[model samples]
Target: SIFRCRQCGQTISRRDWLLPMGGDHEHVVFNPAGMIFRVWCFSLAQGLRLIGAPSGEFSWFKGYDWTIALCGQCGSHLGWHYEGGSQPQTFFGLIKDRLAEGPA
Candidate 1:
């Protein structure tokens, strides 16, 4: 399946997702700001605009810096892009509810 941005229908990512952290691809993360998000990890993604400087504050994955990921077409908050972690590769943590899915 393919995941697209729910607001503007822009391509978000494709299936064959990854579990870079050795757990389930699906994760529920709690932010220090008290916002809870259900995120799905994707090793590959497209059509996302990363905003702000990457920060490691309260990072869910230690040593990973996170940047806000926005929908390229509609500028909606999709989730986050994480990098520079022990995993040794960049990945996306996309919000489940912010995406619409369909067959490839």
Candidate 2:
């Protein structure tokens, strides 16, 4: 599947391009260039930030101890932000299935 910017439709990545945390779902990937999180969510978003934690659980993050993901192109919520600074890795964990499956 190919992930595109929600507003601009800019190509972001492909499913295989992201490192899955497990066969069950996704993971927070790290790289020398940057980071992207492969997360499984129930819906798509317009920008970085969600209302009242979907899971109703909060984790430590920069600023307010939580984060919201946005499209790199249009700046819309693509996923929930995850902070792994202890591992020293940060990424945007978007809804895994939310990404559109490209033409096969």
Candidate 3:
């Protein structure tokens, strides 16, 4: 998989990245570098977090706690969380035809 930054339009793949936490699914093949932030929707699920800024509120939900991450040099908005469910699940969204041109 690949993750792109919403702010500066940077892209990174999951083949050579690193996650802050060292655990299952914590390597580049799973997390990628462009994933800059992670949000937690207390009302949503236990581990269901969104992946990117995604332009606007996701078509499926509203109101989320956007945890932020920045590029080491440029400090741009890359991604955030959208916690899915109580069980360990994963989801990904792409910034297609929207205003994907701003910081989160």
Candidate 4:
């Protein structure tokens, strides 16, 4: 099933996918409400967009270039897209929980 953003109703991604999933649990961040957030995603394409030029220094995985992935339809932050020539394979990670869950 397709997933979506709860705040904007923009289709986010699918529940079950084949996109390469890696970069296990890299960091912990907090929400304005103070909840710990984890970034993760298997595949993305329904309605997502990489918001900036890819960069390597702050990537979750060293040497992997990344850009900020956001909800294309609503402009809310999702996660990152990682990969470049001097880096590893292309990848994307959406902020889990912000997306609505659906049956696969």
lDDT of 2 by residue, 1-104 (tens): 65665566756555554533324335445434565555653222333434344331344233323355556566655666554443324444565544555642
lDDT winner: 1
Provide the lDDT at 61 for model 1: 73
Q: Score candidate 4 by lDDT.
A: 0.66
- Give the RMSD in angstroms, all C-alphas superposed, for model 2: 10.3
Model 4 lDDT, residue 82, Cα: 72
- Cα lDDT, model 2, residue 72: 59
Off by over 4 Å in 4: 18-36, 85-88
Which residue segments of model 2 deviate by more than 4 Å? 26-38, 41-57, 60-66, 85-88, 96-98
Per-residue lDDT tens digits of candidate 3, residues 1-104?
Answer: 33344444454223233232323332222134443323211211112223344333332333332333343234543333433432423223222221132322
Ranking by TM-score: 1, 4, 2, 3
- CA lDDT of each candidate? 0.87, 0.48, 0.31, 0.66
Query: Model 4 — TM-score against the truth?
Result: 0.71
- The C-alpha local distance difference test score for the whole of candidate 3 amounts to 0.31
Q: Give all TM-scores, in the order shown.
A: 0.92, 0.46, 0.25, 0.71
Could you tell me which 10 consecutive residues in candidate 2 have the lowest summed lDDT?
Answer: 41-50
- After best superposition, candidate 4 residue 57: deviation in angstroms? 1.8
- lDDT (C-alpha) at residue 3 in model 1: 92
